[PDB]
């Protein structure tokens, strides 16, 4: 996250860190029940050096605050049993960029490990609304990742505006969230993590999943996120959640 700040410990207890074997933190995810995480499909596609689609290649860390302290009290390490990537996911456009990760053994809920609520299909996150991205991704464009989880406040952008800021790249499954002025954005290593939204009454819903962007924090180039409300039934169908 560029232009953010350190999270308070336990502030985002649904944020998960996904490490690939021999590589450390690669992607974020979010805890939606004791057994299931939500992440981005593009994180789990093989490349020439490594089978990212193979659930055996991954370790999830729940309750993690600091990447240098993976054995801190409250950190929970879990293997993955299964990766369900959305069947319509397109590798080129990142349309339908969502995946569900099944833990081999369940999360134990605590001060540091708690699920985030899923929005119904009808749930509106209006243009202009301040919401949050979190992650251990790069903190400056051209820079490096964070040891301490970062949070950034960004605003939902109108879909027509989003479509024309990134011409011929935006589908109805996507949302732009950020600023026309740049400054605050997700960045490399934030992929798969949650967009968290606080409602007027204080309830927190997951609005989206960090998907892609043209650079980070640049003018007229807000980060792109998978809209979660559209996937409510699909999540229920595949997980029971």
């Amino acid at each position, epitope marked *: 996250v560029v232009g953010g700040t350190d999270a308070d410990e336990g502030e985002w207890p649904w944020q998960v860190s996904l490490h690939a074997l021999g590589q450390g933190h690669i992607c974020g995810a979010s805890l939606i029940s004791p057994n299931w995480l939500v992440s981005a499909a*593009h994180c789990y596609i093989d490349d*020439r050096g490594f089978r990212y689609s193979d659930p055996t290649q991954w370790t999830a860390f729940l309750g993690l605050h600091d990447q240098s302290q993976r054995s801190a009290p409250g950190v929970q390490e879990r293997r993955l049993k299964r990766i369900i990537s959305h069947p319509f996911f397109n590798d*080129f456009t*990142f349309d339908y960029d969502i995946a569900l990760l099944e833990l081999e053994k369940p999360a134990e809920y605590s001060s540091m490990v708690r699920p985030i609520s899923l929005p119904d299909a009808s749930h509106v996150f209006p243009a202009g609304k301040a919401i949050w991205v979190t992650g251990w991704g790069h903190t400056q464009y*051209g820079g490096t990742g964070a040891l301490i989880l970062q949070k950034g406040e960004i605003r939902v952008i109108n879909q027509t505006t989003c479509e024309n800021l990134l011409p011929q790249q935006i589908t109805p499954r996507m949302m732009c969230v950020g600023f026309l002025s740049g400054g605050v954005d997700s*960045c*490399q290593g934030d992929s798969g993590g949650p967009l968290s939204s606080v409602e007027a009454d204080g309830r927190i819903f997951q609005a989206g999943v960090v998907s892609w962007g043209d650079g980070c924090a640049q003018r007229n180039k807000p980060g792109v996120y998978t809209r979660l409300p559209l996937f409510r039934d699909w999540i229920k169908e595949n997980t029971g959640v």
Partner: antibody
Amino acid sequence: EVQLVQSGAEVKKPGSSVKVSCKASGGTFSSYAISWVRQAGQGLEWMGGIIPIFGTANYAQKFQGRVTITADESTSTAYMELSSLRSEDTAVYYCARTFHIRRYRSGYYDKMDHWGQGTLVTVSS
Amino acid sequence: VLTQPPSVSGAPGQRVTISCSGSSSNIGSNYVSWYQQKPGTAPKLLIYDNNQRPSGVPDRFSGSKSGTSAVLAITGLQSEDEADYYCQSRDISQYVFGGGTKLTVLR
């Protein structure tokens, strides 16, 4: 496994044009870009590139004007045409396939991982 | 305009570093990659995004960046590392290479 195979060496009279091709052996460019780089003996020089499936060419300033870069996903072949050839254009021209065009927030032209074998263009009469 | 020393030397086993000096519009604002070119061979990507090593690149290669400079370190160099090494960065809307550094192995 990906392999890019380039067209044969050419000899071109100064002032002529050359069009070098670069075929992706697997029949598809998939979600990757093609970048063109030459080695004229002084060091590597970026010429430009294009995403073949989503094609609008990007060019290096030095070669703006004289270079045209195209690509056809159906024949999985990319092309670089260099016109008004100079003696100093005597070089080995490489095409290279980049990383995935959307996986890295930093982009792709700086991530050239699969290289063609090079095409020698000798500019001489 | 990325500047590299034209020549660096080290003996087998030695650690050597190869510097790439740029400006705000390139290295200062962007990630740096590094490439090796062995004689008579197409270039090979060693490092991207400042310090990331693709699979099939020897562990002895590493990268760093600070401000408007970047460095490739070859730790434990061997006789077969005799080659030219190039840094690469975006510069505004184009990509640029450093002038290249030839590694001489000391004997």
